[PDB]
Structure 1
Amino acid sequence: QRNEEKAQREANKKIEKQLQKDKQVYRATHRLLLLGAGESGKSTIVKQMGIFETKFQVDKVNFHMFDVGGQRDERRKWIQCFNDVTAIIFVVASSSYNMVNRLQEALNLFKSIWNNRWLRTISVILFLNKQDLLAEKVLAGKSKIEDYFPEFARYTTPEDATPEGEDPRVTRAKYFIRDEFLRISTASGDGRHYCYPHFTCAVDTENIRRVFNDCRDIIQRMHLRQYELL
Structure 2
Amino acid sequence: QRNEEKAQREANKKIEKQLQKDKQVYRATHRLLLLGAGESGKSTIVKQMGIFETKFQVDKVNFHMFDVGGQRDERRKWIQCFNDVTAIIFVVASSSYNMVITNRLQEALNLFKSIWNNRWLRTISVILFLNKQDLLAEKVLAGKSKIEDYFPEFARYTTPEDATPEPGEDPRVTRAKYFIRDEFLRISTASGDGRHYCYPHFTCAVDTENIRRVFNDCRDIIQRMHLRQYELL
Give the TM interval when normalised to the shorter protein. over 0.9
Shift of 1:5: 1.6
Question: SS of 1:228's equivalent?
Answer: coil
1:197 aligns with 2:200: yes
| C-alpha distance in 2 between matches for 1:5 and 1:161 | 69
| C-alpha distance in 1 between matches for 2:139 and 2:8 | 71
- Computed over aligned residues only, the root mean square deviation of the Cα atoms, in angstroms, reads 0.9
| C-alpha distance in 2 between matches for 1:4 and 1:153 | 79
- Name the counterpart of 1:174: 177
Kindly tell me: are residues 49 and 3 of structure 1, through their superposed partners in 2, closer, same or farther at Cα, counting changes over 3 Å? closer
Give runs of ≥4 in structure 1 deviating > 2 Å. Answer: none
Shift of 1:49: 2.3
- Name the counterpart of 2:190: 187
Shift of 1:162: 1.3
Question: SS of 1:160's equivalent?
Answer: coil
Shift of 1:6: 1.6
- Name the counterpart of 1:133: 135
* Count of residues paired in the alignment: 230
Name whichever of 2-11 and 84-93 sits farther off: 2-11
| C-alpha distance in 2 between matches for 1:70 and 1:97 | 24
Shift of 1:133: 1.3
* Unpaired runs of at least 5, structure 1: none
> 1:56-105, CA deviations, whole angstroms, 9 ceiling, x for partnerless residues?
11000000000001311110111110011000000000011111011111
* Unpaired runs of at least 5, structure 2: none
| C-alpha distance in 2 between matches for 1:93 and 1:78 | 24
| C-alpha distance in 1 between matches for 2:205 and 2:218 | 22
Shift of 1:7: 2.2
Question: SS of 1:7's equivalent?
Answer: helix
Shift of 1:14: 1.4
Shift of 1:3: 2.0
Q: 2:149 aligns with which of 132, 140, 147?
A: 147
Give the percent of matched residue pairs that are identical in Structure 1 and Structure 2. 100
Question: SS of 1:95's equivalent?
Answer: helix
Calculate the TM-score normalised by the size of structure 1.
0.98
Calculate the TM-score normalised by the size of structure 2.
0.97
Shift of 1:114: 0.3
